[PDB]
Coordinates of N, CA and C in Angstrom, one line a residue:
X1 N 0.8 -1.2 0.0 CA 0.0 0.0 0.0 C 0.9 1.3 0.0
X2 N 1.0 2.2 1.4 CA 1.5 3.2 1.2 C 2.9 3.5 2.4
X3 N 4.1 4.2 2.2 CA 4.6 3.9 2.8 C 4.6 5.6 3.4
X4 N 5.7 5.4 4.6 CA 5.7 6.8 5.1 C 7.3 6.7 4.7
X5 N 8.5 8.3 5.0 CA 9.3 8.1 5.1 C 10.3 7.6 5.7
X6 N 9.8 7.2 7.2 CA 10.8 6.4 8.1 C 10.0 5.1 8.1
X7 N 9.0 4.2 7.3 CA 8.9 2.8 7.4 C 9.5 2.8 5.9
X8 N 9.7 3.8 5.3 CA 10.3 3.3 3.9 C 11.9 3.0 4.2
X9 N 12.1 4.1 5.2 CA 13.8 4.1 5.4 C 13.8 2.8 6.2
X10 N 13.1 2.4 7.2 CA 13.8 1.3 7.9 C 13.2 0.0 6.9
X11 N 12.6 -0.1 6.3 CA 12.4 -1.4 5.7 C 13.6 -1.3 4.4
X12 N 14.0 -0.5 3.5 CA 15.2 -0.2 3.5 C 16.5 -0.7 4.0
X13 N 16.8 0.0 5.3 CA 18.1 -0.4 5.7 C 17.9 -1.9 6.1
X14 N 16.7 -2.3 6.6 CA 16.2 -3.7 7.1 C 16.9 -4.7 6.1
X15 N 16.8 -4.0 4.2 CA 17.5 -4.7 3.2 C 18.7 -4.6 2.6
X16 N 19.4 -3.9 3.8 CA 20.7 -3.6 3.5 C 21.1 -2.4 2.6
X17 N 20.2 -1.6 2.2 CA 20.5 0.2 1.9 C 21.1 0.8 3.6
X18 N 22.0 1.4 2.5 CA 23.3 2.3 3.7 C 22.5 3.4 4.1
X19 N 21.7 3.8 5.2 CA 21.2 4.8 5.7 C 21.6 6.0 5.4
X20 N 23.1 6.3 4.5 CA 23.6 7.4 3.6 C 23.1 7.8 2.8
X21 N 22.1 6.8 2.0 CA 21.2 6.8 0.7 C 19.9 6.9 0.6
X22 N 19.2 6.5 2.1 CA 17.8 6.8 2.8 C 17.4 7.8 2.4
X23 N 17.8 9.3 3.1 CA 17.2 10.4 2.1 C 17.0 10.8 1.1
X24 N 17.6 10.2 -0.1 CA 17.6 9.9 -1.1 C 16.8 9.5 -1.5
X25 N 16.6 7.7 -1.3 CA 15.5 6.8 -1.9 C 14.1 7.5 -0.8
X26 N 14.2 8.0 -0.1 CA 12.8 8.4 0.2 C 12.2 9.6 -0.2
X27 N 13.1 10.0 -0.7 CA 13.0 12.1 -1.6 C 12.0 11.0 -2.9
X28 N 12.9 9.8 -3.4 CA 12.7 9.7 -4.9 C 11.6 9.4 -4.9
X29 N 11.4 8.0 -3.6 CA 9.9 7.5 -3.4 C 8.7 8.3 -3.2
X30 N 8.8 9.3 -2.2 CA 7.7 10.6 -2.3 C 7.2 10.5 -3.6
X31 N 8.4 11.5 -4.4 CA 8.1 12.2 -5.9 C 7.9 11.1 -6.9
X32 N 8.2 10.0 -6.8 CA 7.4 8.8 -7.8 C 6.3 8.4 -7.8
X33 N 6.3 8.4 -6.2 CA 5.1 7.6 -6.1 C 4.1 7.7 -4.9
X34 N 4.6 8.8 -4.2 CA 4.1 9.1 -3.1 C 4.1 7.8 -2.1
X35 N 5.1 7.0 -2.4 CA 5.1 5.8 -1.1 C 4.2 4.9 -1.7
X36 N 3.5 4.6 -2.8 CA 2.8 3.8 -3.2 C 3.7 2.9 -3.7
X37 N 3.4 1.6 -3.0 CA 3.5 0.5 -4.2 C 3.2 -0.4 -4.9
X38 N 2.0 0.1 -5.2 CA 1.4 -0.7 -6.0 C 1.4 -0.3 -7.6
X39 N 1.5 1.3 -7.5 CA 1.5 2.4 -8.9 C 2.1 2.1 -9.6
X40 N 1.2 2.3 -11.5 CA 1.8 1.8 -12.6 C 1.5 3.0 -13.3
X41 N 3.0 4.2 -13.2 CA 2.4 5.2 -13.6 C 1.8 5.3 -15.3
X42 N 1.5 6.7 -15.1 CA 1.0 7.2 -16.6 C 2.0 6.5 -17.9
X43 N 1.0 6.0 -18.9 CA 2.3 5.7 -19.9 C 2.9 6.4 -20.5
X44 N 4.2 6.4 -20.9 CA 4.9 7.2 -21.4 C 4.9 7.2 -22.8
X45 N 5.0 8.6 -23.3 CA 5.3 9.4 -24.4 C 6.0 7.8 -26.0
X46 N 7.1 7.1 -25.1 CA 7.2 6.0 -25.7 C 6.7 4.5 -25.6
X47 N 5.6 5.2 -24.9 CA 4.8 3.9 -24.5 C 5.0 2.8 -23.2
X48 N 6.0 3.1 -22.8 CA 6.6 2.9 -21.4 C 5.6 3.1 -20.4
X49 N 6.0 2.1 -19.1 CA 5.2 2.6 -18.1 C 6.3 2.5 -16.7
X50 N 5.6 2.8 -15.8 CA 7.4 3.0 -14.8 C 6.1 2.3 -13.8
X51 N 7.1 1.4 -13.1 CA 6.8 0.6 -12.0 C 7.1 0.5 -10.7
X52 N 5.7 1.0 -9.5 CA 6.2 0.7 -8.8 C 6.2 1.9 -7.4
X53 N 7.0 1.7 -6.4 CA 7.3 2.7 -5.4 C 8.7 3.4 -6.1
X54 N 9.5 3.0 -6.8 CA 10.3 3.5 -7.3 C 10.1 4.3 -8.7
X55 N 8.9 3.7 -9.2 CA 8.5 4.0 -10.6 C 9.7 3.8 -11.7
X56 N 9.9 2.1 -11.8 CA 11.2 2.1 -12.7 C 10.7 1.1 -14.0
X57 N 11.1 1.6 -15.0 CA 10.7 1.8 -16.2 C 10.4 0.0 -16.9
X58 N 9.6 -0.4 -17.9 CA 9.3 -1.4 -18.0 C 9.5 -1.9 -19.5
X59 N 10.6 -0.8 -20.2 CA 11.1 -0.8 -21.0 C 12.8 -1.5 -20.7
X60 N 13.5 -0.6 -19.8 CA 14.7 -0.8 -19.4 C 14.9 -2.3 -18.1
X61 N 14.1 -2.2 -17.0 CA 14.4 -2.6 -15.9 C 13.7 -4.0 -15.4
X62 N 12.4 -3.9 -16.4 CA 11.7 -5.2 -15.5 C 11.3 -5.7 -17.3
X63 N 10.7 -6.9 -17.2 CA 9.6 -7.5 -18.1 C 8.2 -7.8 -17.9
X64 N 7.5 -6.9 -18.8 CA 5.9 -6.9 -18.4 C 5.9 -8.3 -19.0
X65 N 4.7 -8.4 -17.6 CA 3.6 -9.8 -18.6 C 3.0 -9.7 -19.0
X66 N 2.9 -8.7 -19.8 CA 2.3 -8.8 -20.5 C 2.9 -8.7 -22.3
X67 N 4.3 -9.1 -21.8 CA 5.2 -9.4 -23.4 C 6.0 -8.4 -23.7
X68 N 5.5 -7.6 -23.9 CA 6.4 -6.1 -24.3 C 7.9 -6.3 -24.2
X69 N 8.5 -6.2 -25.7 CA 9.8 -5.9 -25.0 C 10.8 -5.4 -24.0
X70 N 11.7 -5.8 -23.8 CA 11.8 -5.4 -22.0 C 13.4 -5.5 -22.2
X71 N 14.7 -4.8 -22.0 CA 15.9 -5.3 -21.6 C 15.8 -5.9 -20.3
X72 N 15.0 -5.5 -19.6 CA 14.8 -6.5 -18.4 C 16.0 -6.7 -17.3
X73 N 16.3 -5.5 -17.0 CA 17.9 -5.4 -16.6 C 17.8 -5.7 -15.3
X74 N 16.3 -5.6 -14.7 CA 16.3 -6.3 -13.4 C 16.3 -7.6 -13.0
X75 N 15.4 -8.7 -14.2 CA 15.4 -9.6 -14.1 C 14.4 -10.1 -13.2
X76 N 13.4 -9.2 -14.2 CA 11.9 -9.5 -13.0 C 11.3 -8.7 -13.4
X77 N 9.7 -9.8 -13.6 CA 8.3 -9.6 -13.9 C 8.5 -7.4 -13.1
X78 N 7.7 -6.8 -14.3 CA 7.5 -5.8 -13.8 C 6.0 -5.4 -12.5
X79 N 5.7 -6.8 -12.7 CA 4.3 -7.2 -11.7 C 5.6 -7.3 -10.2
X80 N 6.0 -8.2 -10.0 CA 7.2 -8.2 -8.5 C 7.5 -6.9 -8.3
X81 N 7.6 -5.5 -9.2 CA 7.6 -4.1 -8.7 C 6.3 -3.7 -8.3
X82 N 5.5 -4.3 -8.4 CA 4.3 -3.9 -7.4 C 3.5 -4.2 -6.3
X83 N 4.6 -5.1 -5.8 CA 4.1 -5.9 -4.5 C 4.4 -5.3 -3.2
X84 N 3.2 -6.0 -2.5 CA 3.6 -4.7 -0.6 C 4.6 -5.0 0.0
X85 N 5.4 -5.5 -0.7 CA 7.0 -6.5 -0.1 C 8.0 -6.0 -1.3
X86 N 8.5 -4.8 -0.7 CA 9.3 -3.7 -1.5 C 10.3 -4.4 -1.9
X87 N 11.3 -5.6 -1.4 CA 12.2 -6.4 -2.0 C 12.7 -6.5 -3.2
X88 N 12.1 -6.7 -4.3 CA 12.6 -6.7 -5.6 C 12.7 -4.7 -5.8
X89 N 11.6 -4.5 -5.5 CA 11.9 -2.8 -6.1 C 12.9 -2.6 -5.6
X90 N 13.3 -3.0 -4.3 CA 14.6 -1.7 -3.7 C 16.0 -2.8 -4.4
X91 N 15.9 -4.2 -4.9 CA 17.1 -4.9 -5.2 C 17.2 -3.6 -7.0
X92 N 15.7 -3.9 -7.7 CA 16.3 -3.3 -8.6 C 16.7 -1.8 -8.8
X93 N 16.0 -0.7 -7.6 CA 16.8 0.2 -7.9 C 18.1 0.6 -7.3
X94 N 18.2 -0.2 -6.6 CA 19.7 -0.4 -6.2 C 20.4 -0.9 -7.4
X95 N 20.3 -1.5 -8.6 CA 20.7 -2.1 -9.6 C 21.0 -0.7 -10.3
X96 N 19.3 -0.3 -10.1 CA 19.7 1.2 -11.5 C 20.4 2.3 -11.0
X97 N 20.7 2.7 -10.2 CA 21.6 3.2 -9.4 C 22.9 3.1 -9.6
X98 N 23.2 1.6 -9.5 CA 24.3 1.1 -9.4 C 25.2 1.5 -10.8
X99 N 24.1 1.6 -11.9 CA 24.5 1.5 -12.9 C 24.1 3.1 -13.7
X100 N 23.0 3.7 -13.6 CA 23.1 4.5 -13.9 C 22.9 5.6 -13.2
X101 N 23.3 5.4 -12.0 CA 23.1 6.4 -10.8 C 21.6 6.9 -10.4
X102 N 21.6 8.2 -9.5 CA 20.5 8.5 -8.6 C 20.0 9.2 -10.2
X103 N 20.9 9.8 -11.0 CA 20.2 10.5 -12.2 C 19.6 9.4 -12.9
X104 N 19.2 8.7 -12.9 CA 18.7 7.3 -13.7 C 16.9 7.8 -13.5
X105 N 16.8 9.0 -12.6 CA 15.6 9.2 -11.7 C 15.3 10.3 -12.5
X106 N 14.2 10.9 -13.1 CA 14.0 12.2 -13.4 C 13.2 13.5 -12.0
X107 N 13.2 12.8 -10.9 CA 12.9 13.4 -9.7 C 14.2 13.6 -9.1
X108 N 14.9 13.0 -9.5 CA 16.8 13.4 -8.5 C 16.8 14.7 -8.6
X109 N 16.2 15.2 -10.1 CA 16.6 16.7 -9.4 C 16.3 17.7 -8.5
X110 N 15.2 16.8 -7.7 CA 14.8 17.6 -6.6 C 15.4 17.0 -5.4
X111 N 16.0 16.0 -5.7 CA 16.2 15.1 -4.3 C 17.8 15.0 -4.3
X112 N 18.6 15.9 -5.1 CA 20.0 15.7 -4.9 C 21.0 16.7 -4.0
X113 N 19.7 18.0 -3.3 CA 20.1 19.0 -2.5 C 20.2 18.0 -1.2
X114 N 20.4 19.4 -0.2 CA 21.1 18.8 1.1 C 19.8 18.7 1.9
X115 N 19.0 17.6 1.9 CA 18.1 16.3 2.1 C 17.9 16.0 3.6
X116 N 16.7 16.4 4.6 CA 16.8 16.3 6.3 C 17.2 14.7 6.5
X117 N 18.0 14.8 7.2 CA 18.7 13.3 7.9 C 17.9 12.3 8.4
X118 N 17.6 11.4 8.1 CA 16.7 10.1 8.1 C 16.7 9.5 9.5
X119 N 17.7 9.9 10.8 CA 18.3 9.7 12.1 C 17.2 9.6 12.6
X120 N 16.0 10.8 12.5 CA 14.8 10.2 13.2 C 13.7 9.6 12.8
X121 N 14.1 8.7 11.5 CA 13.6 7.4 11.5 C 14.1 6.0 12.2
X122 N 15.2 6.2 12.9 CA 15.3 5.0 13.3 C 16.1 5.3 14.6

């Protein structure tokens, strides 16, 4: 369903995100998705849809099942990005991250200033 910023941070760090990155992934979560995870946002311009509490793309990152071409760079049904067991979303945007950093996000640009400390979430 919906998350707040300190059950998003501690279920988070719960999966091994570095509490360095917390403010971050919870700036992005807000502005994706308002903590939702269940959301399949608006389709995109190239027919894309972004999945998820992270809202990550289903072009690049997951494979719809519903066939669509997919690089599938996560390696997972774009349906597992929408489950109330944030697990796969936070493995794969830790993946997109990993690989194309926080700018991988078109919300980073609001989320890459100096961000209140996530300390009193946990």
């Amino acid at each position: 369903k919906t998350f707040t910023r300190c059950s998003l941070a501690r279920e988070m760090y719960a999966l091994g995100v570095p509490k360095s990155e917390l403010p971050q992934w919870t700036c992005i979560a807000e502005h994706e998705s308002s903590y939702r995870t269940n959301v399949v946002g608006p389709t995109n311009s190239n027919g894309s849809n972004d999945y998820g509490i992270f809202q990550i793309n289903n072009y690049y990152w997951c494979q719809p099942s519903n066939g669509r071409f997919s690089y599938n760079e996560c390696h997972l049904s774009c349906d597992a990005l929408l489950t109330d067991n944030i697990s796969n979303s936070v493995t794969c945007a830790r993946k997109i991250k990993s690989q194309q950093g926080w700018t991988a996000w078109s919300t980073w640009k609001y989320c890459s200033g100096s961000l209140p400390s996530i300390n009193d979430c946990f």
